[PDB]
Ligand binder design. Structure first.
Ligand code: HEM
Ligand SMILES: CN(C)c1cccc2c(S(=O)(=O)NCCOCCOCCNC(=O)[C@]34C[C@H]5C[C@H](C[C@H](C5)C3)C4)cccc12
Ligand SMILES: [K+]
Length: 405
């Protein structure tokens, strides 16, 4: 489905990349996107897929556009446009300067100080999940560890009850794993519908959970509205789910296929934080974007007001112009540059929580289950979109090589 080429887009910049079903996807999703960085592909191209939009293909342009919020607005951040148009999460759908105070409030509840009182539940959570799988000699890592882990952490951050996990999980999957049964807007309303009463409850009777802080916060002078509070809690919920689920999956798929990298981390556990950083670069997975606020020439290319531009956070660290031999994982890589957590005013607020979740997972898994493999005969399937991922991750190990800890 190739949308008619707008008159202002020259034909030499056309490259019909499909972000939801890239060709060569079977070879790995990062590799599928990296086709945009082969030598005969311009720094900035137009695809007619998914309604028609620009794609910046190089770290320098991706970073620049993310810095220039005046021209590249978060008001419509998703492709296709209809999804971008409905989306009203806070602060991701706002531009500076109104975004600033909402980001400050969100930061209180997911920021670096909060990551200390949570560490213990994160550690405990990772250990009991791993210990439950360890004697089986197999799991589907995506389903059995990756999925339950971040939602359980969010419940403890937001002071919500465990029994709600399955309902909430059903709601969020309906939003981010579309089978096409309902529109983005439709799924989002279903989600808000759960959240609306909880905010009502916690505005009248506030506690000390993240939802209570948000719903009773002060922004831009005055108290936050119930509408604003819902739009914030919606994003605090979903922001840390698919990203962490899919990232851990990519990481574990790599370690399962790489005994030498496994052993490196087993022999030298102090290298885990650095290995986390290099995996973050290599298996970067987010791609959202911006909408042009005005006509604007960007690196020799005429962009038109209302044009959408995909600015793939994924691509910056895969750019061979900023990391030599980018497809190779080197835990001893000396200057690891990436925009995996974004760039500019919307830089991931959960990046510190995310790193703890990743580092704790790797530390605790390698200690209990040092030697594991991809199940024999399994072909690992990837999916591509705004948050790329792993369909399933069947792993196997000999329980006799494991230790209860
Ligand atoms: C591997 C894990 C994660 C990755 C790769 C990731 C990636 C990103 C990216 C690329 C953005 C920028 C979006 C944009 O500019 O439009 C972002 C923003 C954000 N992230 Fe994450 N994220 C992760 C985990 C988390 C977690 C655990 C949380 C906490 C619940 C979280 C909360 C947020 C929030 C609230 C924003 C919006 C910041 C703003 O608009 O000012 N993220 N993340
Ligand atoms: C034109 N056409 C026929 C169509 C074709 C193809 C698909 C279509 C879809 S669609 O169903 O594929 N589009 C909806 C998919 O987007 C889900 C992502 O939102 C989840 C919330 N995540 C964040 O807020 C995040 C905000 C930021 C950035 C990331 C990571 C994290 C932080 C959380 C996302 C809908 C309608 C039409 C479609
Ligand atoms: K919008």
């Amino acid at each position: 489905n190739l949308a008619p080429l707008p008159p202002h887009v020259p034909e030499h910049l056309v490259f019909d990349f499909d972000m939801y079903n890239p060709s060569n996807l079977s070879a790995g999703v990062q590799e599928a996107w990296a086709v945009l960085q082969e030598s005969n592909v311009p720094d900035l191209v137009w695809t007619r897929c998914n309604g028609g939009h620009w794609i910046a293909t190089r770290g320098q342009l991706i970073r620049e556009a993310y810095e220039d919020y005046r021209h590249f607005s978060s008001e419509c951040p998703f492709i296709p446009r209809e999804a971008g148009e409905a989306y009203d999460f806070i602060p991701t759908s706002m531009d500076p300067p109104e975004q600033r105070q909402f980001r400050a409030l969100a930061n209180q509840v997911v920021g670096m100080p909060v990551v200390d009182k949570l560490e213990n539940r994160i550690q405990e959570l990772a250990c009991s999940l791993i210990e439950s799988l360890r004697p089986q000699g197999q799991c589907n890592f995506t389903e059995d560890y990756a999925e339950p882990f971040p939602i359980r952490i969010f419940m403890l951050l937001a002071g919500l009850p465990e029994e709600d996990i399955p309902h909430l999980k059903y709601l969020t999957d309906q939003m981010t794993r579309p089978d096409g049964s309902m529109t983005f807007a439709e799924a989002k309303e279903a989600l808000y519908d759960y959240l609306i009463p909880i905010i009502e409850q916690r505005r009248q009777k506030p506690g000390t959970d993240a939802i209570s802080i948000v719903a009773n916060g002060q922004v831009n002078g005055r108290p936050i509205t119930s509408d604003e509070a819902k739009r914030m809690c919606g994003l605090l919920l979903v922001g840390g789910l698919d990203t962490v689920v899919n990232f851990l999956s990519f990481s574990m798929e790599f370690l399962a296929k790489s005994p030498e990298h496994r052993q490196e981390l087993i022999e030298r556990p102090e290298r885990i934080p650095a290995a986390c950083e290099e995996l973050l670069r290599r298996f970067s997975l987010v791609a959202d974007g911006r909408i042009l606020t005005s006509d604007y020439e960007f690196h020799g290319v005429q962009l038109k007001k209302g044009d959408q531009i995909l600015l793939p956070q994924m691509l910056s660290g895969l750019d061979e112009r900023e990391n030599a031999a980018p497809m190779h994982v080197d835990f001893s890589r000396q200057k690891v540059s990436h925009t995996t957590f974004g760039h500019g005013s919307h830089l991931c607020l959960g990046q510190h929580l995310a790193r703890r979740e990743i580092i704790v997972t790797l530390k605790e898994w390698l200690t209990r289950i040092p030697d594991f493999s991809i199940a024999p005969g399994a072909q690992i399937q990837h999916k591509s979109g705004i948050v790329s991922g792993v369909q399933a991750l069947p792993l196997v190990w000999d329980p006799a090589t494991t230790k209860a800890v």
